[PDB]
Amino acid sequence: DRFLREKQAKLAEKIREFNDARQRGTPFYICRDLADLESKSGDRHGPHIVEAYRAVMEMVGEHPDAGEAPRERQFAKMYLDPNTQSANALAMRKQILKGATTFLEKQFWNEVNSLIAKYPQDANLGGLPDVVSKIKAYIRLRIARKTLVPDNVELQQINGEYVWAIVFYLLRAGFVTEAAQYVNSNQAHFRAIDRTFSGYINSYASSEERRLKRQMQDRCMSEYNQRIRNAPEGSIDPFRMACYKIIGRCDLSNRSLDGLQTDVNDWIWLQFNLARETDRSLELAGESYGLAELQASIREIGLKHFPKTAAEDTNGSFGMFFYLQILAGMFEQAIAYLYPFSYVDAVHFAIALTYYGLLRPVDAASAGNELLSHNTRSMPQINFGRMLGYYTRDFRAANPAAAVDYLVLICLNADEAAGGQQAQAALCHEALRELVLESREFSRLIGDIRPDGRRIRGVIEERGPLIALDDFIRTITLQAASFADDNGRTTDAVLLYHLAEDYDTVVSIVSRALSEAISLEIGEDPMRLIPVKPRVTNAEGQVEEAAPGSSLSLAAIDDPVELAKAMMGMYERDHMFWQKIREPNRVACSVLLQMADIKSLVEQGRWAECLDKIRALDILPLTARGDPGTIRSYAARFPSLAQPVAINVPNLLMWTVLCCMRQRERLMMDELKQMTVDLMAYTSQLRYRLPPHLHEALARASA
């Protein structure tokens, strides 16, 4: 769980680099990279998954040392073609076999070189050692180790060289041409021991299909039956049999290397080497062995030799079977088989494959299936969408950016090839929508605000190109905004409603939060708001390109007054926002700000100023001395006043009255005491629109 948490971290960042590369057009090698990470994490099943990755590399054409890599989903159209009897299908099947056969030849060839490099003086090669020369050296070293053959078997020799061993191990290493031309370099010597073989191997090396001419195939098969199949034991060089099995595909019913010293990799190689696909409607029973039969073989080996659950596993052998299923292009089954043993590896390997288009996804209509299901055509499907979303719920709460990287990968299957082109893109949207509503990181996901009101694009809309992205971001903002205004999260609501360009609503929200703060008595603790989540988490020991004050998010605003000033500040400086705010609304907030200031003066202890700013409001009749008539003029204005303003008139009085009575304390005095009681007339005339018993508290503070 701890070493795992680290593994998930390094992988998550690679998936970050991955998406940056896809968007910018930078060369990227997903399989090569994912393999490197897996080889450095030291799992027991590691090496098998590393091998599988590299097998897919050879299959797909991911060659970093040549700056060559296939385009995004280059095989989707080919692999996802439902018509199993199409040109696309036949080509896809061929490439799997070719890739696996090629990979398994390279695998062996590397061993040959390693063994030679381990014994240089013994190898004794010339100035420009050719492959044939290296193979002979490899045979020599095997001989010295007594690991070339099983005892009691004598091999045909020529000048001290086991000619058949040399031919076989050249075919084993994929050097078919060099095998044929080695025989041709020794025509006479081969003519003496086998007059027909040269003809067969030359025909074998001259074609793309690695097949013999029909006429030759008949002759080779007959000969193999009459002179080799049922011959006295030890009457035939074990390697010669092997060469015939390979060259002539003799005895496909027994795909094994009995007389030879072989391991599991030699067996696997033989299976792919002998496999052939055909465009012909029919094949002879004795020549019928392609990928379908090969896959069927691997399938049965799984049930018989390997575990399905993690409780049945012990030493990490499940990796071998996953590896086999990959070679065979049983991709959906391979991933489904691995998930229980290592869901992390399963998830990322599925990403690697889906990127190239080698993983059949469920359609959107059946997006509620278990990991592995089958479609109408009985073909295996992986629920890529759900698998990802499910995977991100191990860290989306404490790392929403990483979660966005994965959810975006859902749109890999959202192209013309997948079939459900736009339905898969819709799934990705909902996955991201449920992420935004579930988290409070709006400054990160949707965007932040600069002092002048300009938006700082969020992570999601920057990944727009990678998810078919207009109104989606605008939509999820409005709902996330309404959800915040209704649930009393004032700061989030202001952030979101501004991003949605609903500036008028923003003013109403700050007016309300500011109105509530003004109402509280002078003495209570100041009203505090929960600040929006910061857009960046600058850290100890780390650098902060994002300095405080550069955005609303990094302003740490938790005071309704400071909030109102900030938003009203930018809205009034730029006429663009201003004209989009209703006059009564903007004017109301302005009045509230004055009120908050008037309140600050009282709580501070400045009487002279209080009176002035209150007089400046021109809401109360405070220039009248005893005038009965003018009072009415203002009483009729009350209903016109905005709610959030009117609701604090009761508070104003208590301030205006208290301050005036204090002013009496420090003609002028008589006049001040006059208005003081004049307010007490203001209330009365409109007493059934203020609190019930304000007088008694008012007159009290009035001595």
Partner: peptide, 18 residues
Amino acid sequence: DPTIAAADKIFSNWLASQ
């Protein structure tokens, strides 16, 4: 049958080598 019987021999032997 021979190929199937042979595969069993190679993988059984391989498993025991773990």
